[PDB]
Design a protein around this ligand. Structure first.
Ligand code: ATP
Ligand code: ATP
Ligand code: URA
Ligand code: URA
Ligand code: CA
Ligand code: ZN
Ligand code: ZN
Lengths: 694, 146, 49, 48, 40
């Protein structure tokens, strides 16, 4: 592997049909016999690993101990028609036969799998690198054909991206994707987060911030994988292990608790359907359930108590699953605005930003980057803005002891961490918690869950308060949230057009109160008239309450103007009220809901069209790539896959900096400087070498 | 075929075969596809209507019970909201189909201590149920056409 | 897919589909790895015929 | 009708240069080419 | 017409030719059925 890594270093910044690439192909041909033996070593033990797991191999396994004899191994292996005569004999030699010719095939299959993985991957990278930079060499495909199983085995782990490299040219980078990283990326909640991010950027995002937003999404996604790993499952110590186990249980099953809370609400309300009011006990009235079973009244008590408990676990589960991401995102943005903008050093937001003003509380706290990983942002800000604004002023703002910086670099102290609850009491950062809770209490999802708390407790006061929890289906089912979004999309217009309806009706009220008061007798009695327009407040209430809801307008309710001196004036009163209010203004409400359905639908279509017609990374359209058959499908899956850019960043973060290659160091340096020029924009490997590749 | 066989048991079962024009006529099939395109959304919005009407029924049962006397008789009142099930049926049956909502059917609240509360009740019922939700249904149909 | 299991071992599985040798192809393709006798049992084939 | 007019104006501004009329696709060959072209090269404010 | 509408509306570029070949085979079978049921 160390020899191959040196060979790969010779290919850094290598163009298609380069001198070094074609020289390295010559060396492999010169040692073709040895290379084939190396390749035949890996495929023999890769094939062996899957063969022993096959059912056909298990047929020959007859020994109860789980072993197989050499003569039985011989007849089992050649029955698979995958090895030659000598190859089966070689495997017999490698098998550790006892004095009884008894073979332990379980350990035999796994003996060389782990040791040969690192070299096997680098051989796959080397052959892939050469095959893509010397694409017209006949002497190279035989190695590729002989390494077909090696290449096939490492295909899911061979990540490749393209960057605009140090040489002002598009370069292709090959790296390793770990099994855990791919497995976590394929998790259903991570995929849903990706879809939400893709929709936001394509729909309401700009091209200038696209890569900065994408990297920030990668960092947030990386943090979520850490949370998912922690909550996953395989006297103070006795309680602590169970407490974290309990909290992780709530975090893992947070959405099942949300579903069970919704089901608990429907069950309660179905019982509430049987409520009845009667004067007799089961001048004040009694409310009681009406049933013959007798089991429903105690059931409501049990269901009500259970519902409050489940909703409580939702708040705890939310605080352990979603809150850390919220605090991480807020700490991350504050840290970068401190360093790359000097928020509270230079600009000093002017009290109109509750987000910027509330973040002043955490600057001097000792535990400001609690969730955000960069625990040295205060050091970096001091080194960047300390000289021009004053080191002692920055240290005061960020709560840093300047005398303690050197001693930490001098040596490391190992104090006594006493496992006592008393010593834990003063170890909490009060000012940070007050800042953190203000961030949590301004989170919409937490506030909704907190609202779900208050109603649930109030349900024990009066069981009819549990009806409010039936509104959870707006958030419970994603479909209903889509229809409800078609109402709140033009919500600011909906309220305004209602306010316009209030003004227009008021003008009609003014006219009626001055000219048409005779027609507002709503009493069939002849001695006690019920004047509805002898007062402006009564007349205005009348027009809104009965005039708007009437099908034909105000003319439906007030008295018939037939044979009156103001007949023609009153008919104009009515058909204008009917046309403006009932016909036109209500049409505006209907049109706004209808328009939002079309507006939201095309947003989905626009996102799905942009994704399928342009590359998310480079921005080159599908028409250019489709010149080669299936060109756009290959480009988005292998060349400019946005998942591989996420995988590369995780690969860079875990890799030791002293082990970074020249290309990895180049990208890592630019990432640390928040410079995104390494992302290919308007260019790609296929375009740069159009002459050589074609 | 089963409906045709039942038509011999009762000739009025042959009326079901009149529905065959949905698939026999391509124009009718397209028009009905313009309804079934958003069928899940239509069912969901009907369920949402049921939920909001249930909430209004709960409010009426708790506070506005005295206004649900649907009997012109004076000594035997037909109270429609003395039971929660009866009140919910009354709402879903008459308030939804009324032009101005439930306030068209229930008693006039003029000169009462809960007058403003009840007018807010009626106006919000009319706006949310009669206007907004039915508008949602018709908009779903129009959007399916488009 | 669960209902299609009933037709695998039937003697007349490709009654309408023209390829009457699909069982032979599947055997020649997967018998070495998963057992010729097991594949024949799955597909209702007589190896001696 | 009014909504698409707003969108068409917004789409035309972000996809073409107000002065020369060359589309954003040509300028985007250089990274952030259209953003630079409309801010420094053919800025309509600079013509004012 | 139905096949063309289906592929152009809710089809991808990677599956297009396979879907077209499958449609061709189904059309070939329907031609045999029509010839069988045809009377002289
Ligand atoms: N740079 C890019 N990286 C990835 N996909 C891209 C890129 N540019 C455009 N796309 C488009 O994104 C679409 C979504 O990706 P794709 O469907 O292959 O993902 P998946 O992981 O298989 O799952 P899903 O179907 O849920 O998206 C693809 O059809 C592809 O055309
Ligand atoms: N010749 C041009 N000059 C200026 N802007 C142009 C030109 N051609 C196209 N545009 C587009 O006009 C848009 C509006 O300009 P821009 O948003 O940068 O202006 P601003 O002064 O920062 O403020 P605002 O966001 O209110 O427009 C830009 O996004 C740009 O893409
Ligand atoms: O995810 C991580 C961890 C450490 N440093 C980073 O930049 N990112
Ligand atoms: O249509 C046909 C008939 C036989 N074989 C095929 O491949 N196709
Ligand atoms: Ca090194
Ligand atoms: Zn690309
Ligand atoms: Zn220009």
């Amino acid at each position: 592997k160390d020899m191959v890594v040196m060979l790969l270093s010779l290919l850094e910044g290598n163009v298609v049909n380069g001198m070094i690439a074609r020289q390295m192909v010559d060396m492999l041909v010169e040692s073709s016999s040895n290379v084939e033996m190396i390749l035949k070593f890996f495929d023999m033990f890769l094939k062996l690993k899957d063969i022993v797991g096959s059912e056909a191999f298990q047929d020959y396994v007859t020994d109860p101990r789980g072993l197989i004899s050499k003569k039985d191994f011989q007849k089992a292996m050649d029955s698979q028609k995958q090895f030659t005569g000598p190859e089966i004999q070689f495997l017999l030699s490698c098998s550790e036969a006892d004095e009884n010719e008894m073979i332990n095939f379980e350990e035999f299959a796994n003996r060389f799998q782990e040791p040969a993985r690192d070299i096997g991957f680098n051989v796959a990278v080397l052959l892939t690198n050469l095959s893509e930079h010397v694409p017209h060499d006949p002497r190279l495909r035989n190695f590729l054909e002989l390494a077909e199983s090696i290449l096939e085995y490492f295909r899911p782990y061979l990540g490749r991206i393209e960057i605009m490299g140090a040489s002002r040219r598009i370069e292709r980078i090959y790296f390793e994707i770990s099994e855990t990283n791919r497995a976590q990326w394929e998790m259903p909640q991570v995929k849903e987060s990706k879809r939400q991010f893709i929709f936001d950027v394509v729909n309401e995002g700009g091209e200038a911030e696209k890569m900065e937003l994408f990297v920030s999404f990668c960092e947030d996604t990386i943090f979520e994988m850490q949370i998912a790993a922690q909550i996953s499952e395989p006297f103070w110590g006795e309680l602590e292990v169970q407490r974290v186990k309990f909290l992780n249980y709530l975090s893992r099953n947070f959405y099942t608790l949300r579903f069970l809370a919704l089901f608990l609400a429907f069950a309660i309300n179905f019982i509430l359907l049987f409520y009845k009011v009667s004067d007799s006990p089961p001048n004040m009235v009694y409310y009681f359930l009406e049933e013959s079973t007798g089991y429903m009244e105690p059931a409501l008590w049990c269901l009500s108590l259970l519902h409050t408990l489940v909703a409580f676990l939702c708040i705890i589960g939310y605080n352990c699953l979603k809150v850390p991401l919220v605090i991480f995102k807020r700490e991350k943005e504050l840290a970068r605005k401190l360093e790359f903008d000097g928020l509270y050093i230079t600009e000093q937001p002017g009290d109109d930003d509750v987000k910027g003003q509330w973040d002043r509380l955490v600057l001097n706290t000792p535990s400001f980057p609690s969730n955000y990983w960069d625990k040295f942002v205060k050091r970096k800000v001091l080194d960047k803005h300390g000289d021009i604004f004053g080191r002692e002023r920055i240290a005061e703002l960020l709560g840093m002891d300047l005398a303690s910086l050197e001693i930490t670099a001098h040596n490391e102290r190992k104090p006594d961490p006493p496992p006592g609850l008393l010593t834990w009491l003063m170890s909490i950062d009060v000012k940070y918690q007050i800042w953190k809770f203000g961030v949590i209490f301004t989170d919409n999802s937490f506030l909704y869950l907190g609202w779900y708390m208050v109603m649930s407790l109030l349900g024990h006061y009066n069981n009819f308060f549990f009806a409010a929890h039936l509104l959870d289906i707006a958030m419970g089912v994603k479909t209903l949230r889509t229809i409800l979004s078609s109402v709140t999309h033009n919500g600011k217009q909906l309220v305004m057009t209602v306010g316009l309806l209030a003004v227009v009706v008021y003008l009609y009220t003014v006219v009626a109160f001055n000219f048409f008061r005779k027609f507002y007798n709503k009493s069939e009695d002849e001695d006690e008239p019920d004047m509805k327009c002898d007062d402006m407040m009564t007349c205005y209430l009348f027009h809104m309450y009965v005039g708007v809801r009437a099908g034909g307008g105000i003319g439906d309710e007030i008295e018939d103007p037939a044979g009156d001196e103001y007949e023609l004036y009153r008919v104009v009163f009515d058909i204008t009220f009917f046309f403006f209010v009932i016909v036109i203004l209500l049409a505006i409400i209907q049109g706004l809901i209808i328009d939002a359905f079309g507006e939201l639908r095309d947003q989905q279509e626009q996102v799905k069209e942009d994704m399928e017609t342009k590359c998310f990374i480079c921005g080159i359209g599908s028409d250019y790539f489709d010149t080669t058959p299936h060109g756009f499908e290959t480009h988005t899956l292998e060349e400019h896959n946005l998942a591989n850019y996420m995988f590369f960043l995780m690969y860079l973060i875990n890799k030791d900096e002293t082990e970074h290659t020249g290309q990895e160091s180049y990208v890592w340096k630019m990432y640390q400087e928040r410079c995104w020029d390494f992302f290919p924009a308007g260019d790609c490997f296929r375009k740069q070498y159009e002459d050589q590749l074609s």
